[PDB]
Amino acid sequence: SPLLVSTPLGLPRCLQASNVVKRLQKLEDIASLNDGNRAAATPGYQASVDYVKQTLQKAGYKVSVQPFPFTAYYPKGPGSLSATVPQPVTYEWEKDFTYLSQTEAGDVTAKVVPVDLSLGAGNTSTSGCEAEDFANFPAGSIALIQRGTCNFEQKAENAAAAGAAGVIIFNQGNTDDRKGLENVTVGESYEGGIPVIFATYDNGVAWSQTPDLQLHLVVDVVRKKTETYNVVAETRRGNPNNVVMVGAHLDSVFEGPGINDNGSGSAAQLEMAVLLAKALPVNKVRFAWWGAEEAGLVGSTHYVQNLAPEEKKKIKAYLNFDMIGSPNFGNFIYDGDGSDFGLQGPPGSAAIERLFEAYFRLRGQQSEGTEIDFRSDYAEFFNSGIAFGGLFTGAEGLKTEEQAQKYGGTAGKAYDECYHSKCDGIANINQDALEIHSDAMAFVTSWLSLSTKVVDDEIAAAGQKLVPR
Ligand SMILES: [Zn+2]
Ligand SMILES: [Zn+2]
Ligand SMILES: [Zn+2]
Ligand SMILES: [Zn+2]
């Protein structure tokens, strides 16, 4: 009924936790038929996107499925490295060598060719940074390259273009702290097609001075360059130049179904969008289900960074819902005004946080602020100066005794002991939390859909933009 759903009085009371739990069960079912997870570049994520899209269309929405590039990478087992010629030597995983993250897999046995080495203390090597560092590089060989100056990606792609079958990069050795193994990457953009490993400085030097040497290199990973998706919809009704946007990431980590993280935000937001289908908002409401958040906020950052300036200034507020059903929950509100932790968001954030506070106070419920640690999809909105806020029931942090007496649960335990785990299933969901944070989501969204004036007022106060007539 439009009577109810168009107001902060009607929307929370018609968004029912039992319906949200139904959608959560659907998400867990999606994960159980898709190898146990709903992660980026998996079938579980694709089914999740389809379930959201088809639900949204069934309610009358036009749905935009925004693709963006995504490189799936993970190691499958330890590497191997062996000298076959001049003499047999088996090197030691994570002591003599390690992978470059984002390497391709491979199994290569080849003569080793050092490339433009500049050894010794104080060196400023450019090994493999330029193209004719590979002058007369015999194709098929393993390129032996020293760290220095340019990105590892550039060195390895130069080696591949020069016909290397594999790349070994050893630490620079210009200081004594730069000779061991390190956590290194060839980047998400890397397109050399050949495997890349990292070795200690002393191994690199020994290899560079061994005539005839042949290395047997094995790199056991999966890597696929592919794409994943944001799902976006918005009300047909409402002012398109004063958009209220809400977002919840739809992907899980690889290790589990991600029903609290973040089925909970996704499902509550979907239920709300369905109810809002018949609403009559003053302000347009936009809903986004973000892809690849667990890989580093990739979908939300893509979406924001690719908006036309005219389009970004139509977004008056962004509301983020990421983990709102934690088993040992607290009632956490983004500290948009910096009152608790010193960092406040763009102007209007204070008003959104006070709206959330108001709702909790009127439910007779305790609440407190939580850090803007940039660990969810509001980040790119913050970087663009868009007013934002959101709700959170806690992750790997431990519940204090003060919090236990405000919110129940168990002090000294994690808010979500199944954070990023296989057990983050439908049974990890605390329904009290889910109901109150769903209601709070509904309350603040509806209020903003009727008047943005508590956000506009702080935008104006901070803005300096003086009207002369
Ligand atoms: Zn060079
Ligand atoms: Zn999350
Ligand atoms: Zn997460
Ligand atoms: Zn605050």
Residue numbers in the entry: 48 to 516
From the study:
Here we investigated the aminopeptidase, P. aeruginosa aminopeptidase (PaAP) from P. aeruginosa, which is highly abundant in the biofilm matrix. PaAP is associated with biofilm development and contributes to nutrient recycling. We confirmed that post-translational processing was required for activation and PaAP is a promiscuous aminopeptidase acting on unstructured regions of peptides and proteins. PaAP contains an M28 Zn peptidase domain (residues 44–116 and 274–510) and a PA domain (residues 117–273).
As a result, we truncated the C-terminus (residues 513–531) by incorporating a C-terminal thrombin cleavage site. This allowed the selective and efficient removal of the C-terminus during purification to produce PaAP_T (a C-terminal truncated form of PaAP). We solved the structure of the truncated enzyme form lacking the final C-terminal residues, PaAP_T, to 2.35 Å, which revealed a large conformational change. Superimposition of the peptidase domains of full-length PaAP and PaAP_T demonstrates the different orientations adopted by the PA domain due to the removal of the C-terminus. The PA domain undergoes an ~40° rotational transition in comparison to the full-length PaAP (20 Å translation at its furthest point). The conformational change increases the opening between the PA and peptidase domain, causing the active site to be more accessible. The rotational swing occurs from the base of the two extended β strands that project from the peptidase domain (starting at P161 and E272). Interestingly, the modified C-terminus (thrombin cleavage site, LVPR) is fully traceable in the PaAP_T structure and binds to the PA domain of an adjacent protomer, where the C-terminus interacts directly with R189A. The interaction of the C-terminus with an adjacent PA domain aids crystal packing, the protomers are linked together, akin to a chain. PaAP_T was highly active in comparison to full-length PaAP (an increase of ~100-fold in kcat, while KM remained unchanged), suggesting the C-terminus is involved in suppressing PaAP activity, in agreement with previous studies.
